[PDB]
Ligand binder design. Structure first.
Ligand SMILES: CCCCCCCC/C=C/CCCCCCCC(=O)O[C@@H](COC(=O)CCCCCCCCCCCCCCCCC)COP(=O)(O)OCCN
Ligand SMILES: CCCCCCCCCCCC
Ligand SMILES: CCCCCCCCCCCC
Ligand SMILES: CCCCCCCCCCCC
Ligand SMILES: CCCCCCCCCCCC
Ligand SMILES: CCCCCCCCCCCC
Ligand SMILES: CCCCCCCCCCCC
Ligand SMILES: CCCCCCCCCCCC
Ligand SMILES: CCCCCCCCCCCC
Ligand SMILES: CCCCCCCCCCCC
Lengths: 145, 20, 96, 49, 264, 21, 75, 48, 21
């Protein structure tokens, strides 16, 4: 019951304020509703509704779309495991020998395999400075055991 | 005024005076 | 290249389904105004609320002076005003 | 309507065989499609030249 | 000169008057539907097309409620050119072919509105004209679409010349909506009366009740079922590819690395 | 054995459960 | 035709259908139909002079536009 | 509800003819119908 | 060209959309 009298009072006050303001500033009888007032309120409502459906989609897509960080093999470790018992042939290379292919280099590879559509596709789709060069070392010295 | 004319309704309007 | 997952759940359906659910519930929230606005035009379209605020303020005055017997009596008036819509019409008449 | 099925063939003979004779067939169709209803009733026997 | 004459005779003229807004809007609704369905750079494109369908529908409502033939002419001209230029921005298709087709129907019905004119009586909800059962169902469905009801109200208020505010405009819209629904029901009860004191038809009860029960079942049980089903699937064989036994012996130099791999 | 008369009845009455009458 | 081919092919006549023919005093005109026939013929000629392996949906276009001409000649 | 839809449709008719003075007046009827439940009973009587 | 009179009008009427009058 305490909450009842509080609700009644709150509503009654809000009504009173509106009644008072209408007595202070009366609105002529039958005077449209002022184009601008309508445009404002209506516009805001429409924009709020736009931001309920479209804006989330926009934000979502924007964040998710960002994808793609170059990943190039640092080293080319070719272990040609030969001997069934003792696999060896571990002559391999690292970053100094590995050459991140440049834009011009990429064009070369793409053109080499241009006749085959999918071959060229692979190369071209992979971004420049993506295709890395496997300059694996072949010299030995490492005897085998 | 708009306010007074939209808050003028009374019971006399709803009397059944030949409402066709 | 590597692809960093900037989705969290699932862009394809997880986040999508959540979005749809949100829209629907926001739908109901917004309907909550423009659906039953006509069920209150009896408690919100009162021409002159001066007599009702007097009642309300008299309840407050009678609680400050601690004459709580009259609090019960003035509350009875408030609840009957709001129990019979026709008496509200009478009491909220513009002039008299 | 045979006058007109021939006009269709005239068009398509050009289309199929891509050449210079084909362009000429195309033109012959275009013309006898425009100025054609006239000579469908005036060339019935009166000079089908 | 000739262009001016064309435009004069498209504005002043001496033609009839039809209201094909209902059909124009329906064409645009189908367009919206197929673009929404056609989410398949592409998400961004489909999102821009969404905003577009929406904005154009709003502008159309404005010109309809303001009965502007000149405004519709301008809109049509602009839209025709712009939609045809969007065919050049294909870089982000059956969906697009259908979108073009239904937009062509919209352009045809829009062109009709301009060359006919706007009729005097433009107000009045399409689905509240007759008081049958189909009108009832369609109206209720329109009210069930998330934001169509409220958008219609606010939009109409902004264009239509009223003395009332949004609050009061929405009041008369609510009253009318409810009153229509009641009227349709009253009319159908007069058309097909139900005998006095005739149970409620066992089958009708079984149907509605059953559906409600099943819906309640799917609130509690079905989620549990789905959850368990997905989570239960567990277990992918993981076998050591190699057996690397490094018997680190020497404290200083750990050795004994004789070990094997998959063949062994 | 759901008749068409029953089918409309069912539909309309579920509509009444949500919407008025 | 604009749904089967694109660019300069079509996008001239469809635009004109929406902005000239359908936005006109009753029956389009005579010049519209003439320009339609003319454009379709020109398009055919230039596609024949090579776009390669040209398609001919302009056959059914030209012939429908000449059928309508016959219908309106008979009035 | 026939008498109430007449009121509602009269508001619509009076907005098309742009006689907005009567819009205010007919809105007053609508709000009083919905401000006094007893008058709704009278106005929504089946026959008269 | 939003005047101050229009600006108060707008504000008050959005308040009426939510709150009473
Ligand atoms: C033509 C195809 C129709 C479907 C279009 C697409 C479907 C979109 C969703 C439709 C779902 C239909 C369910 C309707 C349920 C009736 C309730 C209603 O208010 O329905 C309202 C319209 O509100 C809506 O926007 C419909 C969606 C309501 C949300 C219910 C969906 C359940 C999913 C969300 C679960 C949470 C529920 C909400 C959480 C808290 C919300 C505060 C209709 O009364 P009304 O006053 O205009 O009545 C006039 C006189 N009484
Ligand atoms: C009632 C709609 C008016 C505009 C929204 C008011 C601000 C609420 C924040 C929502 C973001 C638009
Ligand atoms: C339920 C209100 C009547 C609207 C008719 C179609 C609404 C969707 C219900 C069935 C959709 C599969
Ligand atoms: C009111 C209950 C009737 C059956 C539910 C209607 C369809 C709503 C989708 C919920 C899944 C059962
Ligand atoms: C008349 C349709 C059956 C009752 C409605 C239930 C919701 C749809 C389920 C089956 C659709 C035909
Ligand atoms: C397939 C089960 C329900 C899915 C949606 C149907 C909606 C039910 C409408 C109830 C009366 C039309
Ligand atoms: C997704 C389309 C199915 C419609 C959604 C539910 C409609 C019926 C549910 C309650 C009936 C008013
Ligand atoms: C008078 C303020 C403009 C109407 C209210 C919209 C919400 C705030 C947006 C801009 C704040 C000045
Ligand atoms: C900046 C857009 C809205 C953010 C919050 C403003 C709230 C709007 C109030 C509407 C009338 C005061
Ligand atoms: C975060 C501060 C912004 C105020 C939140 C919304 C206020 C206006 C929204 C609806 C108006 C009653």
């Amino acid at each position: 019951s305490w909450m009842c009298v509080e609700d009644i009072y709150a509503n009654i006050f809000i009504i009173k304020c509106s009644r008072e303001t209408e007595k202070k500033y009366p609105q002529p009888k039958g005077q449209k509703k002022k184009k601008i007032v309508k445009y404002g309120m209506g516009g805001l409502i429409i924009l709020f509704l736009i931001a309920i459906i479209w804006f989330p989609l926009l934000f979502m897509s924007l964040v998710r779309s960002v994808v793609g960080v170059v990943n190039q093999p640092i080293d080319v470790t070719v272990t040609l495991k030969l001997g069934g018992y003792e696999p060896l042939f571990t002559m391999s290379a690292q970053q100094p020998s590995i050459i991140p292919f440049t834009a011009q280099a990429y064009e070369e590879l793409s053109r080499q395999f241009d006749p085959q559509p999918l071959a060229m596709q692979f190369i071209s789709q992979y971004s420049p400075e993506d295709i890395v060069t496997a300059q694996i070392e072949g010299s030995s010295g490492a005897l085998w055991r | 005024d708009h306010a007074t004319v939209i808050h003028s309704g009374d019971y006399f309007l709803f009397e059944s005076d030949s409402e066709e | 290249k590597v692809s960093p997952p900037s989705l969290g759940f699932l862009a394809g359906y997880g986040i999508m389904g959540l979005y749809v659910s949100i829209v629907l519930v926001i739908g109901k929230f917004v309907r909550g105004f423009f659906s039953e606005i006509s069920h209150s035009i009896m408690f919100e379209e009162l021409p002159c609320v001066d007599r009702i605020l007097k009642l309300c303020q008299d309840i407050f005055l009678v609680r400050e002076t601690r004459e709580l017997e009259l609090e019960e009596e003035l509350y009875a008036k408030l609840i009957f005003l709001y129990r019979s819509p026709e008496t509200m019409i009478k009491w909220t008449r513009e002039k008299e | 309507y045979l006058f007109w099925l021939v006009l269709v063939v005239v068009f398509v003979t050009g289309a199929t065989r891509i050449s210079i004779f084909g362009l000429g067939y195309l033109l012959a169709c275009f013309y006898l499609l425009l100025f054609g209803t006239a000579l469908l009733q005036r060339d019935t026997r009166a000079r089908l030249v | 000169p000739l262009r001016r004459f064309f435009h004069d005779i498209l504005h002043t003229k001496y033609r009839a008057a039809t209201d094909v807004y209902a059909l124009m809007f329906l064409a645009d609704v189908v367009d919206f539907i197929i673009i929404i369905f056609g989410f398949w750079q592409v998400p961004e494109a489909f999102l821009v097309m969404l905003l577009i369908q929406f904005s154009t529908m709003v502008v159309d409502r404005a010109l309809y409620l303001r009965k502007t033939v000149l405004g519709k002419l301008a809109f049509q001209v602009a839209l025709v050119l712009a939609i045809h230029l969007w065919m050049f921005f294909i870089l982000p298709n059956v969906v697009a072919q259908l979108w073009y087709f239904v937009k062509c129907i919209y352009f045809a019905l829009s062109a009709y509105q301009i060359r006919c004119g706007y009729p005097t009586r433009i107000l009045g909800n399409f689905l509240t004209k007759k008081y049958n059962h189909l009108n009832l169902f369609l109206f209720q469905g329109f009210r069930l679409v998330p934001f169509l009801v409220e958008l219609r109200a606010v939009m109409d208020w902004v264009w239509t010349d009223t003395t009332l505010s949004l609050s009061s405009w929405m009041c008369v819209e609510d009253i009318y909506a409810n009153i229509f629904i009641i009227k349709c029901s009253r009319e159908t009860e007069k058309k097909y009366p139900q005998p006095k004191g005739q149970k409620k038809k066992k089958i009708v009860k079984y149907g509605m009740g059953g559906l409600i029960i099943l819906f309640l079942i799917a609130i509690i049980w079905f989620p549990l079922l789905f959850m368990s089903l997905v989570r239960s699937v567990v277990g992918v064989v993981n076998q050591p590819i190699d057996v690397t036994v490094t018997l680190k012996l020497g404290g200083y130099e750990p050795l004994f690395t004789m070990s094997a791999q998959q063949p062994s | 054995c759901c008749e068409s008369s029953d089918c409309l009845e069912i539909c309309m009455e579920c509509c009444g459960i949500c919407f008025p009458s | 035709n604009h749904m089967v081919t694109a660019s300069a092919g079509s996008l001239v006549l469809p635009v004109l259908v929406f902005l000239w023919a359908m936005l006109s005093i009753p029956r389009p005109s005579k010049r519209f139909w003439m320009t339609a026939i003319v454009f379709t013929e020109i398009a055919v000629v230039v596609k024949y002079l090579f776009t390669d392996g040209y398609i001919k949906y302009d056959l059914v276009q030209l012939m429908a536009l000449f059928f309508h001409r016959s219908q309106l000649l008979c009035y």
